[PDB]
């Protein structure tokens, strides 16, 4: 029922979420949690939204998931001040996640996804 691309995206998601042990990025940030958030952050993202996008087959490539992942981390560094736990978590998550989503790792996954096609 799921494509090789969807399955790879879900495996990468599990690796990225393990780097968020405090679960700060699990769910959408609301204006109840973060006053004025919606006026500061115009393109919100979180892991639960990414998971739903995978399930709905909204991602056409791993790079599109990588873009959403970077956006998620950047949003938290834009809204939160550097001293806060949320900013510090976002900086660490972004750095760790960019190594999980390295261009060379992505290329290798693309190859194996492509191999399942035109058989």
Ligand X SMILES: CCN1/C(=C/C(C)=O)Sc2ccc(OC)cc21
Q: Which residues bind ligand X (CB under 6 A)?
A: 24-25, 29, 33-34, 76, 79-80, 86
CA distance 80 to 73: 11
Residue among 4 and 87 whose Cβ is closer to ligand X:
87
Tell whether the torsion through CA atoms of 16, 3, 112 and 45 is positive or negative.
Answer: negative
Token output for 14:
């599990």
CB of 23 to ligand X, least distance (A): 8
CB of 50 to Cl ion, least distance (A): 20
Contact residues for 109 (Cβ-Cβ < 8 A; gap 6+)? 8, 12, 62
Contact between 103 and Cl ion by CB under 5 A: the answer reads yes
Q: Among 67, 107, 84, 102, which residue's Cα sits nearest to residue 29?
A: 84
Q: Which does 102 bind (CB under 5 to 8 A by kind): ligand X, Cl ion, none?
A: Cl ion
Rule CB under 5 A: choose which of 102, 107, 108, 112 binds Cl ion: 102
CA 89, distance to chain mean position in Å, is 14
Q: Which does 34 bind (CB under 5 to 8 A by kind): ligand X, Cl ion, none?
A: ligand X
Q: Summarize as ranges the residues that interact with Cl ion (CB under 5 A).
A: 102-103
């Amino acid at each position: 029922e799921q494509t090789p691309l969807q399955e790879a995206l879900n495996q990468l998601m599990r690796q990225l979420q393990r780097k968020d042990p405090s679960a700060f990025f699990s769910f959408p940030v609301t204006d109840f949690i973060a006053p004025g958030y919606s006026m500061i952050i115009k393109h919100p993202m979180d892991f639960s939204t990414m998971k739903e996008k995978i399930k709905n087959n909204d991602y056409q490539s791993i790079e599109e998931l990588k873009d959403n992942f970077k956006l998620m981390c950047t949003n938290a560094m834009i809204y939160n001040k550097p001293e806060t736990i949320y900013y510090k978590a976002a900086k660490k998550l972004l750095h760790s996640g960019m190594k999980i989503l390295s261009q060379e790792r992505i290329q290798s996954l693309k190859q194996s996804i492509d191999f399942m096609a035109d058989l």
